[PDB]
Design a protein around this nucleic acid. Sequence first.
DNA 1: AGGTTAC
Length: 344
Amino acid sequence: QLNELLNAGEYKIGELTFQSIRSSQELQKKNTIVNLFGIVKDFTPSRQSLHGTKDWVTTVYLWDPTCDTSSIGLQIHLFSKQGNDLPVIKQVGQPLLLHQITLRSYRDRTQGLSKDQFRYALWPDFSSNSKDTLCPQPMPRLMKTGDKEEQFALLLNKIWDEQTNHSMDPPTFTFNFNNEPWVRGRHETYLCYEVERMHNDTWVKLNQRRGFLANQAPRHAELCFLDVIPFWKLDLDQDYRVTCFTSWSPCFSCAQEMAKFISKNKHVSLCIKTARIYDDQGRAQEGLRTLAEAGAKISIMTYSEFKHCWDTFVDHQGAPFQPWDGLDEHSQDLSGRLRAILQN
DNA sequence: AGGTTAC
Ligand SMILES: [Zn+2]
């Protein structure tokens, strides 16, 4: 549902027609008034101008999936006579809906300038650690939105965070990645992924193109991982190989979706390293085979991987990886158990 | 004089 919205340039939500940020970053000679809806990648507090009409101004940089991960976004200057009605943004990551913004050149970069009537709507950084990233906004310019643009805003937020959050809490890593064959009460799947580009006949090792994520209650971590893939701006000619590192092997249902991903993407290879083998003693074993037979490459995490995930996806803050007793022992029986699965 | 001010 979200992939195709951002392609044509214009997409509608509620009753308002939005223009993507990438498409907005181009220009015509004349000024054209668009609706925007994105993430605050950076902003500057509302200070009063020192020149010209001296109106109050706040600065935002909106981003959306049509811009790459590393892209800062569209420069937008929001102006107002009173100024005490401009959006009060508290931190980077807030979803932002802007209504009636003019698009023009300034010394060859595209900026947005606010119309007089410009209105807005803000949302908290949902995937932040705080609740109160969103404080009570000034009433004059504020817009009453519903649940429909709730989905959209949260979606953009979720994709943003799942591109600007590599680091994880160290006690979390210990507990979830404990590779003892049967454990309680992990319940959730933690998934740490790498991306590798094809250049010079060998994988270009991508440190900044990494990420990790954890599931919701009751979708799955495997599905949430697949959602950020289309929003990677992947070169269609270049072949890519994903290696994700999971805490639990994917269930039967997510193994099917990860298999149907290999069928949909002809330039993407999928390689899975898991810490435990999830066996529901139902169709989970078949799911490993089905994903396997679809082209995907699965194996058990060994000491090499456990060190690497601690060197990459954890906020060790200087502590080297401290292994638990029986890590190699459990990874051996599991390597036997995995080998037995692909045989049946 | 809609795009100066912000830059
Ligand atoms: Zn699953």
